[PDB]
């Protein structure tokens with residue numbers, strides 16, 4: 001430890017919530033209350049929006065160059081790397097994420113800030129774009145400027161990282177942001193506020209409001225002076241936010257869950273390498289990954305041998321305290337999530353499916369929301385386990401003979417986030433790239449991504465793209481500037 | 497004039513609606529029923545979505561190249577131009593649009609199809625974009641593909657043109673589109689269906705469902721198999737569509753109304769040139785223009801001189817049946833609109849504003865929804881006339897002394913679509929380009945636009961951009977494709 005105790009971060013200052021409420025920090029490994037966070041309400045949202053509006057109107061932020069904002073982004077990145085070990089420890093204590101994964105997230109945070117710092121440095125030369133028109137009387141160009149005040153509502157699965165995926169491009173674009181992290185994992189996001197204080201980030205450029213979704217997130221979505229909402233989390237929450245934004249014809253982006261498939265063909269070169277990618281696609285982060293490859297679709301010729309290697313690798317996953325450097329599986333984030341995940345596993349048993357491994361809590365761990373990595377077989381398409389996102393370390397399996405059957409099973413979901421194809425056959429991998437009904441496709445792996453690439457899905461996984469140039473462009477207002485250069489009258493109407 | 501009688505256009509066929517309902521076509525100039533149109537319901541929507549999905553799955557649409565789609569787009573453009581006189585007369589009879597304006601819309605339809613045919617040819621070369629990663633174990637690229645099934649809900653003010661702004665980029669991107677034109681002006685959109693049949697457009701590529709908003713448009717927004725909604729029309733309908741789309745976390749774009757300002761400075765070179773641009777920005781299309789410059793903000797030194805020129809040009813506008821030569825003003829589209837527009841004028845009088853000219857139906861025209869071009873003065877910012885979009889030939893006027901007052905008045909709106917500045921001062925025009933809280937800025941003109949330019953607004957005018965590359969990109973699904981090229985194991989987990 002120690003566990004920080006912070007207030008809300010608004011207009012460059014620490015501010016107590018108007019209603020003075022607090023909500024707890026629970027360590028999911030021990031189930032112990034380890035501290036508390038401020039619980040913001042609509043009165044705090046109003047203050048945060050006024051502070052963000054003040055930033056856009058001030059020279060300190062609203063009139064900065066992209067080069068100037070890039071300096072702030074880099075200074076935040078350097079303070080994150082300086083505090084790396086402390087922040088990774090807090091990330092694990094708060095979320096249950098392993099220390100190794102928490103440390104990888106911190107490096108991804110630095111990399112995300114650096115990527116956007118570079119784009120902010122290129123931004124100003126692309127501010128004004130002359131446009132070719134088939135006319136000599138008109139002169140036109142496209143002007144790109146910050147969109148304004150943006151609300152960023154983020155999830156607990158990558159507490160600081162998911163916040164940065166939104167924060168880094170919003171600040172790079174010149175927007176003033178109001179970040180609303182999950183009430184289940186707010187420590188590192190509140191530490192971002194302290195970092196912004198340390199680097200002298202201009203007042204209102206970033207405002208951090210912790211609290212319950214309906215009380216703190218909800219008012220952002222219905223606020224008259226929030227220009228856009230960027231959301232990552234559950235589909236039912238996304239629908240609520242979009243419904244509230246519709247009343248003010250306010251744009252929103254939604255990065256929602258998935259039921260991503262991993263398709264394993266009989267021509268894979270190495271069974272252990274493919275089995276390891278399968279474990280990674282489903283058990284990493286205790287399966288609390290939107291893009292997790294939760295449905296294994298395996299070719300019948302290798303199914304038996306591949307399942308053997310998969311089960312052997314799975315039973316070798318070290319489940320322990322997340323702070324242990326060699327921990328491979330932490331607990332799920334909360335009691336609510338623990339109950340939800342165990343209910344999915346029990347419903348699968350009651351529907352006729354087979355628990356090939358896991359499905360229980362580990363024997364040596366009496367406390368903590370620990371769920372064993374679970375492999376579910378003898379699964380049919382009508383089962384809840386096949387259709388619904390579990391958000392736990394739970395993999396379900398179906399076999400196939402033909403490529404056509406694999407595509408049909410792969411696309412047999414209402415979601416459309418990611419998908420993976422494991423095969424040595426280059427033309428087959430290209431066919432799957434086109435056929436998978438998703439926003440992300442992995443070939444001979446599952447999960448890796450880079451800042452340079454667009455991230456997002458389709459169907460019930462939502463819309464909009466995070467990262468790459470898309471992340472920044474989501475935060476720009478586009479203007480058409482059209483000038484009449486001819487000295488002649490329009491000559492549409494009759495002169496009096 | 498012969499009025500065509502058509503059925504719904506679905507899966508390459510003329511199809512009767514399931515419930516066999518039809519609704520009248522009213523000529524706004526005569527108030528007479530001149531024919532009828534099919535009235536689609538939810539069962540017709542279901543058939544159109546299935547036809548659209550079949551097109552996506554068929555090699556002759558879903559597997560076409562951009563060059564192949566470009567050939568259909570150009571064939572549609574050629575057919576529109578061959579039938580220009582017929583289509584332009586039909587557009588006037590249906591909507592009340594002057595024949596001269598209807599003819600200009602047909603030139604723009606052909607031009608829009610031509611611009612998108614060009615973009616479709618370039619699309620194949622940008623289908624796969626390799627992305628440089630600073631990695632030795634991964635290779636990634638961006639894949640752009642059609643978004644899928646798209647619902648396009650369009651308004652009556654530019655019946656065919658507004659349909660084409662959505663249809664041309666949807667077909668260029670390779671989507672299968674379902675067009676839902678306004679029940680107030682559907683003749684030309686049904687004629688578009690006949691043109692698609694004549695040119696051999698593949699079945700399901702474009703489906704045209706005429707009918708009432710809640711009956712035919714509604715099920716499109718709530719359909720499980722519609723990937724996106726593109727809407728142009730009123731803010732309240734936009735809100736209802738986005739609300740329905742939210743339950744299925746379906747993306748939408750909303751192009752809504754505005755209360756756009758025209759700012760006139762005392763350094764204008766010619767009073768008559770600026771006065772004609774002002775008439776054009778408010779009276780053309782009977783003021784039924786989303787981007788109309790409905791608020792005149794005039795510098796106090798030139799106000800009296802400018803208003804006198806404005807009155808003289810205004811009183812010179814020929815109001816008559818829209819098919820007549822030299823008609824400069826047609827009627828409003830419907831009885832509902834007529835009453836709404838006259839109600840706004842009577843409310844301004846009740847608020848203490850002055851009706852400088854017009855404000856009534858013209859004396860010489862006993863039939864038709866004719867409203868005289870109206871100029872409203874002695875307006876204050878609290879008045880309904882200043883705040884609300886009238887969507888009629890109604891200009892309201894305020895004076896200013898300083899640039900600071902002009903900017904405050906210009907941005908004193910909940911809307912943010914377009915804005916115009918009339919001044920010879922180059923640096924001032926540059927300051928307004930930045931200062932106007934809009935998506936469109938005109939310099940020394942009001943209304944001109946080109947296909948190469950992004951069109952849309954911010955604030956209550958909505959979000960998303962039509963036209964240019966934006967129009968096309970709105971209809972593409974973006975895919976990240978990440979491949980692991982290394983023969984090495986991931987080495988995250990412990991081998992058994």
Ligand code: NA
Nearest residue numbers: 026094184185
């Ligand atoms: Na926590």
Ligand code: NA
Nearest residue numbers: 522590591680
């Ligand atoms: Na009509």
